[PDB]
Amino acid sequence: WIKTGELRIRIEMGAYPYMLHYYDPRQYANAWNLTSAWLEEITPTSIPS
């Protein structure tokens, strides 16, 4: 639903480490891969940047 549907979620975090991925503006770019892997790797213990 999140990917191709109309669901948008705001995750309350407070503070969090972040990481940057720069890209060339003049070329297609779809961040689903990264945001997927982020969600995939969340844990009752962990939470990647």
Partner 1 sequence: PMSTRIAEATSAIVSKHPAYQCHVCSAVLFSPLDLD
The minimum distance between CB 32 and partner 1, in angstroms, equals 19
* Stretch 16-35: interaction string toward partner 1, x if CB under 8 A: --------x-xxx-------
The minimum distance between CB 29 and partner 1, in angstroms, equals 12
Of 23, 4, 16, nearest to 36 (Cα)? 4
Tokens found for residue 34: 């990264």
Q: Which is nearer to partner 1, 27 or 45 (CB)?
A: 27
Task: Report helix, strand and coil shares of the chain as percent, to nearest 5.
Answer: 20, 0, 80
Site residues (vs partner 1, CB under 8 A): 24, 26-28
